[PDB]
């Protein structure tokens, strides 16, 4: 149903059976990156404090750097200088350990995702990847693109000045929908000094159940939109007459 | 030849003997005393520099810094007892977090 | 005038391919001066209680055994005894 192939095909826009109208994306790209950051002056290394054994696996074997590590509790993935080395399990954005996902049609609100098999809590699913904007280009491209009559706006604000576009290039995390009963969410992990956005689960999702995440609600124009889920307390519209960003 | 070559030491003996008469300790310093005290000072200096060199090799460095001296002194049972009331400049503290604060 | 070249001579024997900064050299200078003042002051105190007019290797050894901890003082007494034995023989 996903069927990632590099040849462009005869599906116009809906991207449900043929994914090669737009382009896909790996780890994100930058435009005006300068060497002013906390990268390699104080966050040179943040090494965990672990005294492992690493010679006894599959029999009396605890997995290395579990939920007792100093870095997993503080939402930081380890570097290559780990005492476990190539046996540490924190490095999930670098070894690309993902979850089994699939994109088919569920409701007429749009496209989304449903879980293939069972998937426990606090389990990584997908990384949000896109194109990183800056100060000036955002308020020009939003008014250049609002007059193009698009439904889906793929904007996520990383910080107070960084907004990531996942429209021209996007991974499989661009189809995930909104509901007032969230079972997945977003977290802010710091890998290699840079901040990255991920998707974790919260409960024991059955095989064949929905996987959506809660939006922090936002309007930018005069119009309003509404949600079609209706779990138990679906507001649908926004939080009134707010105008923040 | 010097007396440091006779005793086999590296710290000088005449400077220690001069500081013993000069600093008003007794109407008389003895003798074997500057050799004995130079041996004690050389042993303590070599112990501090050995632990500082180990703490410097543990962080992939080739120059001993006051942080390496701080870690070498505070990560030892008896040097912390000998130097408990001493503040080292640009030394910092030992990284530790109490177990009732971690989630 | 200080103990800097002697600290270099001691450092090049226990770790050959290493260096040391000037701040660490000043800290080692202060350490050597502090331990010198402590041992000399305690040996000056020990020579007054017995009404003697001197200071001797026995006085320095008694000031070492009172001041240093258990495992450190034994090696210090052994090194000083070996050094004062090699001075006359």
């Amino acid at each position: 149903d996903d069927f990632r192939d590099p040849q462009r095909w005869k599906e116009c826009a809906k991207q449900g059976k043929m994914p090669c109208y737009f382009d896909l994306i790996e780890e994100n790209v930058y435009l005006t990156e300068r060497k002013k950051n906390k990268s390699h002056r104080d966050i040179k290394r943040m090494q965990c404090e672990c005294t492992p054994l690493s010679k006894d696996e599959r029999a009396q074997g605890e997995i290395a750097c579990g939920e007792d590590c100093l870095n997993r509790l503080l939402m930081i993935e380890c570097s290559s200088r780990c005492p476990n080395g190539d046996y540490c399990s924190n490095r999930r954005f670098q070894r690309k350990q993902h979850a089994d996902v699939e994109v088919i049609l569920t409701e007429k609100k749009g496209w989304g995702l449903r879980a293939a098999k069972d998937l426990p809590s606090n389990t990584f699913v997908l990384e949000y990847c896109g194109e990183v904007l800056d100060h000036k280009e955002f308020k020009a491209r939003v008014k250049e693109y609002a007059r193009n009559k698009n439904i889906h706006y793929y904007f996520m604000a990383l910080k107070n000045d960084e907004i990531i576009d996942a429209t021209q290039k996007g991974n499989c995390s661009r189809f995930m929908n909104h509901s007032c009963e969230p079972n997945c969410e977003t977290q802010k992990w710091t890998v290699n000094g840079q901040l990255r956005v991920g998707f974790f689960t919260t409960k024991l999702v059955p095989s064949g159940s929905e996987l959506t995440f809660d939006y922090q609600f936002q309007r930018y124009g005069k119009e309003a939109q509404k949600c079609f889920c209706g779990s138990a307390n679906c507001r649908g519209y926004l939080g009134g007459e707010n105008r923040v960003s | 030849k010097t007396r440091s070559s006779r005793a086999g030491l590296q710290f000088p003996v005449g400077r220690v003997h001069r500081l013993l008469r000069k600093g008003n300790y007794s109407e008389r310093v003895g003798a074997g005393a500057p050799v004995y005290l130079a041996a004690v000072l050389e042993y303590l200096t070599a112990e501090i520099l050995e632990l500082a060199g180990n703490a410097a090799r543990d962080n992939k460095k080739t120059r001993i810094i006051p942080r390496h001296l701080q870690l070498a002194i505070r990560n030892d049972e008896e040097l912390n007892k000998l130097l408990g009331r001493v503040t080292i400049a640009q030394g910092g503290v030992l990284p530790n977090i109490q177990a009732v604060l971690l989630p | 005038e200080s103990y800097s070249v002697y600290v270099y001579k001691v450092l090049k024997q226990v770790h050959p391919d290493t260096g040391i900064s000037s701040k660490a050299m000043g800290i080692m200078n202060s350490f050597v001066n502090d331990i010198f003042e402590r041992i000399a002051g305690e040996a000056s105190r020990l020579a007054h209680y017995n009404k003697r007019s001197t200071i001797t290797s026995r006085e320095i050894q008694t000031a070492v055994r009172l001041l240093l901890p258990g495992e450190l003082a034994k090696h210090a007494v052994s090194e000083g005894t070996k050094a004062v034995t090699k001075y006359t023989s």
């Binding site: 390699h40 002056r41 040179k44 290394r45 570097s79 290559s80 200088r81 | 120059r63 810094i65 006051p66 640009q90 | 800097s4 070249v5 600290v7 270099y8 260096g19 040391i20 900064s21 000037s22 701040k23 660490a24 050299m25 000043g26």
Partner: peptide, 18 residues
């Protein structure tokens, strides 16, 4: 393959015997 900022060491120079 990776190294720290040299400024860390610059703030405390090595002792000069001369």
């Amino acid at each position: 393959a990776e190294e720290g900022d040299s400024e860390s060491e610059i703030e405390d120079e090595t002792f000069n015997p001369s």
